[model samples]
Target: GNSKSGALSKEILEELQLNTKFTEEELSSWYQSFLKECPSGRITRQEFQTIYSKFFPEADPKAYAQHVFRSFDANSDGTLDFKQYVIALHMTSAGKTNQKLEWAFSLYDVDGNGTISKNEVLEIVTAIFKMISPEDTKHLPEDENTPEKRAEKIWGFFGKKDDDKLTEKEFIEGTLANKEILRLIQFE
Candidate 1:
């Protein structure tokens, strides 16, 4: 039998390991999952949403998946091949705090202009809240449950002036400096 087009090459495996957080052992396991879920070797944006919806069964994954796919879609290709999927999985789950926030910043920087406006942040924040399980939000005080209010709180952390756009520096620093605001996006 011949090697399939999607078969992981030794060179590619080494590259994925060096470029991402996953080790070879784990990558092999994830490759199995990836092939099973993405038989065509690519996951379209719509397919990603379906998978996300299943993972977040208790929440509305639609809006969240939209922003997530935008961030993970390197090259703006509108689909995730295995390499992109593995890196994205690491960013969302096992990466360091700054790495995770950097990815989050990309999601909020909807225009890809390297700055985040209140409007931009609110859009992504609203999307995230839509996928936030009730268990995650129920602990908030009565007034903070709504997406609008939660977004307000998040935006306030990034700038003192309402018109200030958050640079990547501000986004990472401000998020790290504040624990309460940081928890809003913490997946675990």
Candidate 2:
């Protein structure tokens, strides 16, 4: 269950401070800044993106918003209620081992029900495949990109599944098991 108390847990705060580039004092300062900007304690997607961009200048704010919203709108309603928002936050935290799985969960919750179904999982997997495929690239392909083939080739991983669906556990586990995702993050 998601906590709606609107407070950042001490453990979560500590982890974010320790793992991310921000020092503990810096993080605290950022928290204060966030509070000042969002005094209601509820951060809208646009507001979150604005703050995030200040930290990750290289990242596309719009793309990040789309990504985060797409992950949290479990019901496909295009809006994230409080629970969905917090769960999405928990899932995206850098501390998570399988960040992609968290994204998958957001994609799969197509109905915005706050729970993932098998069909939703399959849809998210398909979406991920389409997103990471070379066909989606707009610029010149790197040495690894092939004109005749899509990069990552996720179809090869699940094309032969007995069911055209994945359960929550299966979806998360499979995403975490993907070597390509790890490579993208340079997890090694």
Candidate 3:
């Protein structure tokens, strides 16, 4: 526990500068906000969910937050420190196109096995559907009405018909190839 609540350490700041798209000032401010909301210097999964729910109060953010929290827990320590949080934030919001796509791939991969299975995509897609508002989904075709159907449709487009898994390359290219599917699967 070398991290202190007072400020970001020099070593941590250097690593973040090298890895993320944020500037030192931006990271400092982001860290300040993180500490403001999470005074403990680390945020648990539940706290992450509460913060996400606060942002999207109209939608059910529980399932979506769970997946997001799991993906951001890079060390698998069951909590998010400032480094992990800031890295994921940069990837999700400010990284290169491929980098952002990779983040989405991780969200779908779920098991950290470097490949995504059909069940994994379904689970995450279903979670996304849970977070979607009825008002937002009402315009979709009836075939894509249910989460199962929406998941299948997305998989049908991105996944091989006879294959049961998607590699990171496949997921990224498949998403890059389809703007419509990107809108459906992308988290904003």
Candidate 4:
């Protein structure tokens, strides 16, 4: 019902230019969806987590959801404004491949470092572990399912062997080649 609030501000227009992959009207439609998701024209981090958590009811969504929420909160202002939400959606939805990979790295890079270490990845995998019910876990193989084990599997995917820290190149190149790596990164 709040759809006719008027066009996006000048700042949002220029900001959206970073990814000119979409036309003006095309972006307006996406902005409408964000408004519905955030009627006040903005959304809190906790609210974002709750929305994402619904999709992962089978796993522990809180942990992983928090990480994802942080990534989307680009400004780190504890909330996702329409611009932040729009840009984030573009990055995750249909932006350049490299941009998506970069975003995924930022989510998993925990400390905000340029690289992703086994510890960081294990942290994500651990949250995923918590999200998955024991019944579901039982069906998965014991050797290949632990946080460390899965981390090991992913490390191999990176194709580089250095004390567990995967540089940006290693992460992108590895992710590009491995579906398992891509799957782990794909929150959608």
TM-score for all predictions?
A: 0.59, 0.46, 0.61, 0.55
The lDDT values for all models are: 0.59, 0.46, 0.60, 0.57
**In candidate 4, which residue pairs get closer than 3 Å at backbone N, Cα or C atoms, i.e. clash?**
59-131, 60-131
lDDT digits (tens) for residues 20-60 of candidate 3 = 34444554665567777775568776676665555345556
Q: Highest lDDT, which number? A: 3
lDDT of 2 by residue, 1-188 (tens): 12322234334533432124554456566565655655434556655566556554433443333455555542434333533554554444445454465454444466655554455444444443333424454364565344223323443454545664545666566666766644432210
Sort order, TM-score high to low:
3, 1, 4, 2
Per-residue lDDT tens digits for candidate 1, residues 30-126, read 5577777665567776666665554435446555555656655445556667555545544554433454666656656767788887777777767
Ranked by lDDT, top first:
3, 1, 4, 2
For model 3, the run of ten residues with the poorest summed lDDT:
1-10
TM-score: which candidate is best?
Answer: 3
**On residues 35-129, what C-alpha lDDT tens digit does candidate 4 reach at each position?**
77665567775666554454334335455445555554346556656555545534543543454665667666766678777677777677656
lDDT for model 2, please. 0.46
